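Input set for joint prediction.
Command: fold jointly, output tokens.
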Amino acid sequence: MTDRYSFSLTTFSPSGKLGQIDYALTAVKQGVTSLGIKATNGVVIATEKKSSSPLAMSETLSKVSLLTPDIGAVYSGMGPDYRVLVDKSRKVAHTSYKRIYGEYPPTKLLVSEVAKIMQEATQSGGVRPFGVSLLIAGHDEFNGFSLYQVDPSGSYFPWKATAIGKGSVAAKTFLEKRWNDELELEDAIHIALLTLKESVEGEFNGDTIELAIIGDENPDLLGYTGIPTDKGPRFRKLTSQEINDRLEAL
Amino acid sequence: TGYDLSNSVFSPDGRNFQVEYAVKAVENGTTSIGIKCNDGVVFAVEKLITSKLLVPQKNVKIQVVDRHIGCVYSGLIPDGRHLVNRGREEAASFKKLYKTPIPIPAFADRLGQYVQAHTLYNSVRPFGVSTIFGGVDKNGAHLYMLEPSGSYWGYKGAATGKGRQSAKAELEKLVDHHPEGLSAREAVKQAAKIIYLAHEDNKEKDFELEISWCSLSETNGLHKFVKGDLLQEAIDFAQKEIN
Amino acid sequence: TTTLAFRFQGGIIVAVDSRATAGNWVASQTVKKVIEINPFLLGTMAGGVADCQFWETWLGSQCRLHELREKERISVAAASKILSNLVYQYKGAGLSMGTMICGYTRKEGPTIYYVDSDGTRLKGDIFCVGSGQTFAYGVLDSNYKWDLSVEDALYLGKRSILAAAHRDAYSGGSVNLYHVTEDGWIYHGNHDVGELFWKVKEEEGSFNNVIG
Amino acid sequence: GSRRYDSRTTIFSPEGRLYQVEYALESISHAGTAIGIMASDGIVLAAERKVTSTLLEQDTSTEKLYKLNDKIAVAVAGLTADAEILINTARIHAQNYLKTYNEDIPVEILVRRLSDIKQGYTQHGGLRPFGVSFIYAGYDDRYGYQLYTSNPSGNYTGWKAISVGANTSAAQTLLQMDYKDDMKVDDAIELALKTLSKTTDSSALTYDRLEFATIRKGANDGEVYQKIFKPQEIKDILVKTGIT
Amino acid sequence: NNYDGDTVTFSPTGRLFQVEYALEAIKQGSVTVGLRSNTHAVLVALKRNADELSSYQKKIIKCDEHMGLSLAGLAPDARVLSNYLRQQCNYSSLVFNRKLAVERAGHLLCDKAQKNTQSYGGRPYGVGLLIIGYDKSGAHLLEFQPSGNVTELYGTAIGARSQGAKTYLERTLDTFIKIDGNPDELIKAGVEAISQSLRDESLTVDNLSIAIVGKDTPFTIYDGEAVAKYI
Amino acid sequence: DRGVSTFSPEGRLFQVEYSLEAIKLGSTAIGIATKEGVVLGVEKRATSPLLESDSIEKIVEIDRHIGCAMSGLTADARSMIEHARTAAVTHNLYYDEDINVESLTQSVCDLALRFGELMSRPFGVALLIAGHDADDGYQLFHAEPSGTFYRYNAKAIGSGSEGAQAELLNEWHSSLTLKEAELLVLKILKQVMEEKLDENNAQLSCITKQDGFKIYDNEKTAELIKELKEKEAAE
Amino acid sequence: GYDRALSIFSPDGHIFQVEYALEAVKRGTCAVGVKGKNCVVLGCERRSTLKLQDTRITPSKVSKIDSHVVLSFSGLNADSRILIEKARVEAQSHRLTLEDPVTVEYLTRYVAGVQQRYTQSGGVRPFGVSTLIAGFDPRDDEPKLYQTEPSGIYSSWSAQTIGRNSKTVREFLEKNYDRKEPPATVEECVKLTVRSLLEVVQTGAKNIEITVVKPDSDIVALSSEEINQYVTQIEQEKQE
Amino acid sequence: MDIILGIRVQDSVILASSKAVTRGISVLKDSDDKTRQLSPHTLMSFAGEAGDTVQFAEYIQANIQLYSIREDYELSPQAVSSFVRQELAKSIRSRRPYQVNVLIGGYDKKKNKPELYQIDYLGTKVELPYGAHGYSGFYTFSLLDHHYRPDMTTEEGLDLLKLCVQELEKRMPMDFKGVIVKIVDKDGIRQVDDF
Ligand SMILES: *[C@@](C)(CO)[C@](*)(O)[C@H](CC(C)C)NC(=O)[C@H](Cc1ccccc1)NC(=O)[C@H](CC(C)C)NC(=O)[C@H](CCc1ccccc1)NC(=O)CN1CCOCC1
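tokens >
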């Protein structure tokens, strides 16, 4: 018995490719489209909620996830792989940072830890790479707002705006025409909804779309009062009703 | 293809061919049966006499677990012994912690989980035995049969080995003709007959009969071997029926 | 125990007593306190009998393995350091040993090393070790010269053990003598203190404190 | 068992080569070019970013050039994720030395240890090697300014000028042509950029597709300064040499 | 064919080829016989040499005062298994002050061989063993196969041309079983039995190897001039 | 590929059989046992003339009463010799006596099959172990990587083994003197060696009760070579 | 832990991984060792496809193991560092326990033992390196030169070469080296070493390294101009 | 073990260490050298628990010698002292700590300056113009506070050292059998034979 697979399952081919990473990126291509746009006073991340059955309750399945009060994440690719990465990402933020410095990590460093975990699945014994690409939006005091993409290889890049998955080629072109450096947050939400309508085929409403922002602090969502320095989470998930209001003036 | 070369690999059907190959080793083995009765269970088995040089009565195949459970099996005899050794460890740790002897359904799952564990990795081989086993507990009598996949169920009657079909047919007739129930002493006699009738499927070498039983009234809820006058009485009953 | 060894013009003299004790109980009068490691190496024993006996015997096995592996007899320095490094590993565990590793090699010449159970290792010309070491020092130091003859050196070693055997309650039995030369060690007999004391008293005229 | 699926990453070919090391070098040859040039009064590090998108955030980005300590930096060619694993190990190693001896680690000692880690992945463990080649630029008070390179084989060598990544053959010929020993930093800056401009696979070399860094003694009296260039500073230095 | 790479693999018909290949190593080995009466149990073994300049490979090994075995196949595997038996016999004596039953000795050998047939990396044992002994239930003879199967018998033989001696003992069953209180006659029957497996070679003084255990006889081995009586 | 501890259909271990082929490629080593002592001889076989032949060490001491010669992948023999020397000295420490030659050989052979998936492969070297003890007298053993060992009156191993063994079959008798055995090893070595036998490319040794294990000098062997040539010309 | 047996026997009785490690040695730059009456000299080739090199800081081909012993090699450069490190540690350990520096034979035996261990251990490949180890034993004036190889065998040599085109330079040394009369002086020993490398190298500029070891821890490396003088002298005598 | 002293002057560092080794009521040796050369321009003297002292000194010696061979370069006295301190700082929280106090005297060739470091068994390091371990300091520190000047020569430093030894021989209870004196300067390490 025991794990006899102590050797690498990802290796270099004669041409210099890393097969399993390429094949993982192919799985990301098949995945549903998701995007992220960065404004002057915030960041938006969005994706389609592809339902498996109409009997299934899509509210119970969350594609957009809170990692810290000021950091969120969305993906394209294999859902199960994403779910466990979110668990590990939430934990590593505490063990390797908050329990040491008494504060949450900045976006770039949390991203750096997630990227490490994904890199190890590319080199360690008896495992395949993760079949997902992540988009991670976040805010912190000394860097301001920021948006990052993380690929199966463990590489990460900072973006002004980008898309991943099914119709990412067309969606990136659409964002190049509309994006400027003076965009307000509401303008960025409007552009996010327009970009997503092109890739979605069926119903296009608040129940089939999932969208969250990184913006101003929310004292009402904090859950307590008395400490002036604690002002609330910057991450907020838009409701079904809040999306439909913006779809009328579209 | 090549899906059958490694254990724990699914074929495109969703099958584990290495387990199905282990079943072929069970089918090649000698016949063994189990009969459930009014207040207990009976076990019997075919022992092929390869040579005159074998010592009669001195190559015992039926095995006891704890003091209330019996185990018989067909196929690779060493694999069965390994399963019983584990069973004895499982029962011992149950009684150690919980005081009471291990219930039959509780014991059945301990074996089941252990056999099933040997279908999960390519670094182990599946078991090459089907095991018929059971006994008496607080809720009465129980008879079980366990297969290489880890699958097991409860049984009114059970059979496995080279003459399983002949033994199954004969077992079905007893269930139909006795809806109210069969007695312990009757079930010993019937067990002899069915082994003799199932020997027609292995009739080159002549054989030796071996029976055991557990009963609330006859054996006081403990596992014992059938010997002497009661064994010969069961042999004679079987001899009269074949002629 | 009383044991000594000193270096001189004609090599090394080694002398020991032969008593073993358990408190005030004299357990033996005939104990061998010198160990013959090879034809050119000797080891002396003081402290715990088992400790000394066991480990100095272990030392000989390690020395034999050296010459098998290296095709050359081990140096006195390297031999003494194997023992000192061993006892250092056990430091604090309660080993009780006072030993002297004595021998000749080409590169070193006649050499003596003191090694004890708290890890001390010292090269030197003269050492006395054991419960009666001070009594031996008193005679040895006051009569020692480098230019002693082989005959006189043997006697001084013998006479120094006798001095300690007389005054120290936990020393006695007999004297065992050894002489180490360029050609190897030579045994110079067992000398019972029962006869030796009176013989020395009469011939030398010493020990006037005792009733003649 | 699991023998069936083992690629055997640490074996020899019949010709006496290491398969996985050779294939890792093939991977690195498609990565963006990085150049290091050593002058008498400093060191230059220049590197080309991999095909950039206009919506990429350029100022808050790091891909090629990393800081190991106050006196040592590296340029990367290959898998970025693999490089960061090694960079963090090198950063820790430097601090261990400083903690132990109360002195900044000599450049070669840092390079040797990082190269020894790479070597281990080619001889034991059955894991794939790191698909990364480094150019090390640094200073210490024994040898002064120093340039080194290391590759997946764990072999390292010292250089006056060197390139890694794509088009090294063409790039090395150009550096061998114009380089001389009495060269200054400002001249070496110009050589580094001119060489990338001629070897690049892009149409024209622009500020947004470059990473640049110097290591001078251009601070105040007998001390070394590390300058990682900002976007606007690359835009200016590109105009000043007449490339754009 | 494709299913004989290791012991962990079953064939399509349910066979374990590595176990069968281990069984083949026993067939190539030199013949050895075992038989018993009610009072005594005897082992006879034909020893084999490399050439006229070499010694003859010893076939019989003592396990305790009341138990031992003969071997056929890989001799180093017999050394491992016999050493295990020596330890088990010894554990019984030190802990329980009990002589190990011959039947339990077999059960322990079976379980040790089995574990080597169900795990990756390992290999089956490549040797067969005939175990004799005298315990609280009289004399005993056991046959061990590296498949794990252990069988108690009145008499048997293993090795090359072992079928000849096995047939003879099957005929002589009624005679030799009643040889009680007579060691030399029980050996004579065992020597005549092994003779039915000889081809071109006969039993010489440094070729034959006999061992006996019984009621008032500890397990002892006879070699050299001590077996000249039985030629 | 395939498992390291796999059986062939004929019932043999693949890796053990393949290691025997490596031993056949090795240089020749011969041993002869007498009532006056045991002689061990080997072919040195230098790969080039610039190589200093006296550094070639294929005959080795285990203890004062036990010697050893080797043939095959000789680098593999180092850990075997190390184990043998430790086993011999350890027994002396535990029992205050010399260890039997047979018990030493058995201890070395226990290492043999300790390979699989313990070391990664069998040893690729065979050993001739010669010695004396009080019980069984002068002895010679052949230790293989199979874990098997036979006692021999005389034995050859290496590339010229089958030819040298046939010659030893005819020449050996139970009354051979030590001198006669010395010449016989030289004679048979000269026959199977490629290059011409002399004191520099061949080495003799012996073990006697009185003087123990001794490797001969090049001067001593040279005279035995000259004595051998003269006797063959004398009839 | 990774357990795979990588070094195993083949049907013909060869261990291919050990033999393929020898091919890596054949690919490496040439290295030569010659011992005279009172000295040993180690010569090494450096390939000239690498210009723009910094020779101050680039790892040297000859390495000091202790103050009285040196080690050169041919084969994989990265592999050699591991052997050199282990050797240096053992050298200091020997001084600590035996209170005497290592003999050249002892140091060689240790390095060779490490190489052998990597030929029958699971999860590792053999070292793609052969070494030349030279020096003088403590308080001794007899020169010592030893060779090792991936299999683990080691031996002593009057003169020896390893690496690429080593069969050509071995041919040269076999007819030019007299056992009855070795190079009497340092100059004679260096000249014969340079001559032998000039049969294979190309140009005698920055391609040849020479290191001279004399008794009592006296080791020095020659500079470019010093070596170039030997190259200039040999060529003028050749035109005859 | 008992007395170890150190003085740093203009161009050199001078270490003086007692020669006696005493066990029980017996002086076993009167010529013991309580020092080890770590590198050509670095010297360490030591005192403390029997066995521990030499074992520790030689362990440090081996490590510094290993570094020298590996890098073909001599570590600075500051670097060596920091390595030694860390080893003692590790030791103090071990199962069985090294009970050894040391002085490190060295000449830094890059700075052309002599340096003296005092380190105790806890791993407490200080650089000093003059230093001592054990009971010696209770006499020598006040004496040196009076007579020491920073610009003194090696000869002046030796006379200053004679003044310390004389005081210890007058007021110390135990007979320490004189001292071995060694000088560390630009030219390396040498021993004064007549003191
Ligand atoms: C001079 C003579 C005095 O020291 C020498 O130093 C000799 C050394 C020579 C013989 C090597 N030393 C002794 O004789 C030595 C003194 C000693 C005693 C105890 C501890 C340390 C040193 N004596 C012994 O070692 C005696 C030997 C004789 C045969 C009795 N042994 C003991 O006292 C033993 C074991 C001591 C021991 C050590 C470590 C752990 C546990 C025990 N003890 C007993 O036999 C107990 N005792 C004897 C009296 O009867 C009741 C039981």
